[PDB]
Write an enzyme that holds these catalytic residues in place. Structure first.
Site, short mmCIF file in Angstrom:
data_model
loop_
_atom_site.label_atom_id
_atom_site.label_comp_id
_atom_site.label_asym_id
_atom_site.label_seq_id
_atom_site.Cartn_x
_atom_site.Cartn_y
_atom_site.Cartn_z
N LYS A 191 0.88 -1.19 0.00
CA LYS A 191 0.00 0.00 0.00
C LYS A 191 0.90 1.23 0.00
O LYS A 191 1.65 1.41 0.98
CB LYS A 191 -0.92 -0.09 1.21
CG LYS A 191 -1.86 1.08 1.41
CD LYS A 191 -2.57 0.94 2.74
CE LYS A 191 -3.23 2.22 3.16
NZ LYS A 191 -3.87 2.07 4.48
N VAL A 192 0.82 2.05 -1.04
CA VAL A 192 1.83 3.12 -1.26
C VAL A 192 1.15 4.49 -1.45
O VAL A 192 0.03 4.57 -1.95
CB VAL A 192 2.72 2.78 -2.46
CG1 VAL A 192 1.97 2.85 -3.79
CG2 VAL A 192 3.98 3.62 -2.50
#
Lengths: 289, 291, 289, 290
Positions: A191-192
């Site tokens: 998750k960025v």
């Protein structure tokens, strides 16, 4: 053993909702004019209402034990079509912010949250250029073992911060350096943060997203913190064109209704249409593969 | 050689009416925020600081200068009025956590004898105060600083500034200012430079009570700094602090922050900044006359 | 009557305006005063401003509606400071307090002269599509009211957008007003500063010299529309162009409205600004030979 | 020359209508959002035609202006067949520093020509001031109704309250009521009204204010979004319809937030369309309750 299919839409895209924000969410209520001090029950009621009203449009919802996991389960707030992700991060405040440091939450009982129906855990990893990479990798390895030994998926969220010492901070390079370090760390999902805060020319956003994609060796999704809610739909489309598989978003769905009257009406009329559109964009992009 | 005394940095009345222009990366950030072309060159800071000294030093009993951008230039250009004493910053600011001043140490590069030869009468040291950092390290830095000053016949000015703890979310700014004074208010410096309680806001009676509480913990002369106080409330803050036992001010932002990025810098310092510094000096004399 | 009665010893004008009516009530509301704002709040502020600031002014402009009678009865005006009485009747409309202005038929010029007043003041609203002859006739009637009673006449032409159309060039309107009213037989012309006192000094001087060429009586600038920080430069540039000083309110006292300890704030914040403006006027008059 | 309200409603009979007819007011919005000045006419035309093309599929009718987009929307087939066309018949006169200081009937509108193109209705803004003549407003509405009805078009009137020309007595909530008492039975087919209280505050007070307004309107009525935060407009539609309104005719609450953003077509589809879709769903939910 849960697999990635357990938290995706039928298309295989990720269209996931985050409501796990803790002291950061209390600060949002205060900033929107809620009576201070803001009671824990205000956060719990908002989180459970958000899950109840928005989980029908989400492939998974991210809940925290501190304010809403137990309540969402007991009140049957989570749609059967929507998988539960439980936060496994312990946020440590410092230097005047709510999340200055993060460790694995030693209070999470993985078997107990699995019995309650959780399919995945999530861990925030704060990334600083002058803190030791090996300590971050070791925390991710311990987290992966906690998840995988219990048949749960592991979701890691590397978030870049300025160095503890020095004034050299290039946010765009830090996001790339975090992905070079943690993008092959054996988690199930990365998750960025969106490059460039989702701002500017579409062509530059795509180039920055393709650069990031090259360093991530697991499925990846974007989070919405730092992206204007109006630019988040474009960010999902561009990230997915670059190789992302969807989103795990909170603020770009529900931040704008905090402090408005008639919370349940506002989640249905303002927040739900935004989450519905994001899910449609994910399916459109998955269909192009 | 010269042994400087408090009288050398005060007005004839004995009040302190002192100007600060020693801000470093914090001043560069102010120029950027006011719409200066980025990156802001060092020369923009130097030119502003020297102009501020040239135009405002006639109204000040002392001016605080930094070696990084303006001390050498102010001396070489005779920018400092003879009636205005020079104070040299002796702090080394360390950036971190996205701010310019995350940590501070004594500047080991300051040659006290050399700055004294150039005419300096005092040095200044910022001390960052956090509830979860060791008091003994702060006290040791102040002792080393006092020895650097006093061994060279220079006055020592300490500036304790409160910050949130490194770890935890318990931060009471008003209590932290009191705790810093309880710790450092009798540390053997010549002058204590302190943040104004309550940011100088609210009812005069509450501001006086908060200032009297602070006065009780300071066992040396003390002055207030302007950071965090609206320029329009700073004159009242000086009056109330002095009623509580302070002896004046050492101010930068409340004098010159509003002219940063305006056209015609020299005109703006004379027409906007100087009247504010002149009024603060008149208030200091009025309050010294009452004692 | 002589212009010397409202000037500093240098012959420069350093005059204070406190005659603002419903516009001043709106300023109190905007600064967070309890609404509705009582008349007594305006009266108390105006009389305090006269008492504290008149020692630094060559003249003070007072209105009968809120403060003339009170300032006289309370001896608020320093003997060194001449009184100017407003003779304008403001008519609200289109959501603003001063949509139209007529000569105040209630002003007793003989009575204000007996009280020691030296001048009257008349706002003239100037619009490109309203009749020049009606403005000139109002100025002629006003000049006769002043001169027949041994009082000076101060006119204040203020430009407004046209009643009909969207062609509004504020800088050209100021010039057109001066071409029309700059030789109208008043003793003093009170004018808006070109370009709101903003921009390069050289462009401000050119605009001020252009305006000077159309004014055939002494002229002063007002501060409405000029940032208080740019007003000192505006006075210097206007006087370099041929102006003889200022008649200012907002650039002296607007910033203290709604602050605690009004009398302290007028003395510590407002007075230094008015003192500096007076010093600039003397500096510029000293260059004149 | 038969005309019917059913031509501009959803199947439910609710009104879910889109406005893109804003003229100099829209140019000011582009400037305020950081568009290069001076803003060319083509920037307004391109935005209006894109808005019609992308949003008309979710609307029972779209309101277009001849100045910037009617001809272009027709020529480019931008209006979905499911979406009726409303043509503005108002001539805006700027004054006192604003774009719409006065309004008259646009004598250049050819009602027969727009009817041949498939338009179903005309719209007329009526500025209402307490110190201007009621009879002149009523006479303009009568002339407008005759222009519409004689050509088989529906008449939509939009009374908008303004402060008086002279005086400072302006009670916006009472002005809206006084305008409805004057024009609410004027023989138009549809009354387009400002939302009481800007849609702000407690739902119970908003409903009371909406029911008071309903009592003075003797034709179907819809709310416009000008002055209502886009996030409060869905609740405003629900409350107005509970009080007796039949839907909305909205522009700003649908598309104002995308002005000046990059990728206009993407932003209309991803940001504006979901808001218009939700408003249409609310209209159907409220019509189903009656």
């Amino acid at each position: 053993n849960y697999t990635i299919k357990d938290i995706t839409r039928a298309s295989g895209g990720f269209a996931m909702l985050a409501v796990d924000q803790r002291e950061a969410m209390r600060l949002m209520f205060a900033a929107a004019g809620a009576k201070t001090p803001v009671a824990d029950s205000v956060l719990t009621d908002f989180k459970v209402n958000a899950a109840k009203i928005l989980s029908p449009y989400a492939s998974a919802v991210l809940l925290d034990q501190q304010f809403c996991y137990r309540q969402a389960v007991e009140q049957n707030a989570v749609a059967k079509s929507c998988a539960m992700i439980v936060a496994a991060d312990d946020f440590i405040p410092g230097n005047g912010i709510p999340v200055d440091n993060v460790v694995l939450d030693k209070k999470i009982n993985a078997q107990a949250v699995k019995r309650d129906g959780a399919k995945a855990l999530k861990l925030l990893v704060l990334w600083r250029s002058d803190e030791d990479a090996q300590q971050r990798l070791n925390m991710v390895k311990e987290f992966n073992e906690l998840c995988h030994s219990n048949g749960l998926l592991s979701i890691i969220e590397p978030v870049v911060r300025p160095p503890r010492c020095g004034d050299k901070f290039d946010r765009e390079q830090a996001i790339i350096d975090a992905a070079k370090e943690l993008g092959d760390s054996g988690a199930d999902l990365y998750k960025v943060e969106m490059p460039l805060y989702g701002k500017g020319a579409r062509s530059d956003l795509l180039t920055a997203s393709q650069r990031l994609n090259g360093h991530i060796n697991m499925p990846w999704v974007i989070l919405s913190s730092g992206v204007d809610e109006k630019l988040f739909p474009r960010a999902v489309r561009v990230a997915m064109e670059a190789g992302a598989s969807g989103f795990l978003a909170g603020r770009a769905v529900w931040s704008s209704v905090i402090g408005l009257p008639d919370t349940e009406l506002m989640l249905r009329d303002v927040s739900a249409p935004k989450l519905q559109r994001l899910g449609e964009i994910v399916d459109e992009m998955m269909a192009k593969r």
